Amino acid sequence: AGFAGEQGPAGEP
Amino acid sequence: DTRPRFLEQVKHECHFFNGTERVRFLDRYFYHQEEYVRFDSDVGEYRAVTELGRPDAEYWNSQKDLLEQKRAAVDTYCRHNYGVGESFTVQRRVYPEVTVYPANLLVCSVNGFYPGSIEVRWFRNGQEEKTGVVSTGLIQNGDWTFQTLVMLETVEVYTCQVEHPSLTSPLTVEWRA
Amino acid sequence: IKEEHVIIQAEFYLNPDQSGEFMFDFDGDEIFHVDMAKKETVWRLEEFGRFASAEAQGALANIAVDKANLEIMTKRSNYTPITNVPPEVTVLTNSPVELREPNVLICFIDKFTPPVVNVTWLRNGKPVTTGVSETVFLPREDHLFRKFHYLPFLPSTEDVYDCRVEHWGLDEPLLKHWEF
Ligand SMILES: *[C@@H]1O[C@H](CO)[C@@H](O)[C@H](O)[C@H]1NC(C)=O
Ligand SMILES: *[C@@H]1O[C@H](CO)[C@@H](O)[C@H](O)[C@H]1NC(C)=O
């Protein structure tokens, strides 16, 4: 069984 | 090294209430210590905190793909990971070891236990001492074990009693004066 | 009132040091981190790795994003640097100490930022650089850091120990002393 890592968005320049 | 530092922190947080019955998910963004934006599952969209997150609040909240991803995180992320980890985290139980010695202060040293939840009680001649108790409180050892030192002011039999989720019944250690 | 449990995937990126961290925290203890040098999952306890897996590659991708967000956020702040917060340092043992009975010294470094320290164990003023261990930077709810360093030892009347800590918030290195 694998832990899932949560992704994040790129920010606004 | 005098040069100024710049720190970005991200904390993807899963809070579990009543096992997995209720779950809160926070995506929290930090510049140094300054939380500037977050996604609160209970809120259901991004909110700018210290309004350096204003751009990120709008731009992220305008990407409805992202939102359904994040609105789903309490299932796809939090409840999933709880399941994976439950066996060796939520259910981890390691017994306390208990040592009593005079430091008077009579020391009850309670060591190597998991989880942190514990009750340490002093008895003098079988009666609970509710005054003169000097406690460290809970000390995290950083290796999935805890300790606590619970010291009784004394001037007979003294017994330290430990209750902990790992134990079927109280652990006692006696010191006869 | 309060939750039974919290799981936190905590990341940071620090410029100009180019230091990344990616770790999972369960109720204040580390499940794992990704070693950014070996690009590898490091389980805080070995057995966690027999119970579960994590794909280290996804963590490297998050860290790339964190550094890009950092640079964006550095400009949006007008280059507001971090204020150094110097650590509190405590040395304790794992268990009650008895002469000639194996024990472990714990150096607890707490409530500090940024997440950069140099830590040396000193036995009678001399560095101990084999058979010691340490944690990565552990997150705090106030968004400062803590860290632990460990020294297995044989208690003796003859030896003294110091945990020596350097951090940009201090004016000089801090020595925290332990002796029998
Ligand atoms: C940024 O910092 C400089 C010098 O500290 C100051 O002169 C400038 O006006 C600041 N501007 C903005 C828009 O933040
Ligand atoms: C730690 O040690 C190195 C030199 O070995 C030095 O470059 C660095 O500035 C030190 N860091 C801190 C936080 O004192």
Whether the CB of C173 sits within 6 Å of ligand 2: no
CA distance A8 to C129: 38
E strands along B3-145, which residues? 6-17, 22-31, 34-40, 46-48, 97-102, 105-113, 119-124, 127-128, 133-135, 139-140
For B69, other C-beta atoms within 10 Å of its C-beta total 16
Q: What residue ranges of chain B are covered by domains with CATH 2.60.40.10?
A: 97-176
Cβ <8 Å between A6 and B80: no
DSSP one-letter string for chain C: ---SEEEEEEEEEEETTTEEEEEEEETTEEEEEEETTTTEEEESSTTHHHH-B--HHHHHHHHHHHHHHHHHHHHHTTS-PPPPBPPEEEEEESS---TTS-EEEEEEEEEEBSS--EEEEEETTEEE-SS-EE--PEE-TTS-EEEEEEEEE---SS-EEEEEEE-TTSSS-EEEEEE-
Distance CA C41, CA C57 (A): 9
Which residues of chain B are in CATH 3.10.320.10 domains?
8-88
CA distance B50 to C106: 37
B89 shares contact with chain A (CB less than 8 Å): no
* Rg for chain C, CA atoms, rounded: 18
Q: Does the beta carbon of C168 lie inside 6 Å of ligand 2?
A: yes
- Domain B97-176, architecture per CATH: Sandwich (2.60)
Nearest residue in chain B measured CA to CA from C95 = B111
- Could you tell me the domains of chain C? 7-76 (3.10.320.10), 88-179 (2.60.40.10)
d(CA C65, CA A9): 8
Residues of chain A whose C-beta is under 8 A from some C-beta in C?
A: 1-3, 5-13
Fold exhibited by the domain B8-88: 3.10.320
Resolution of this entry in Å? 1.9
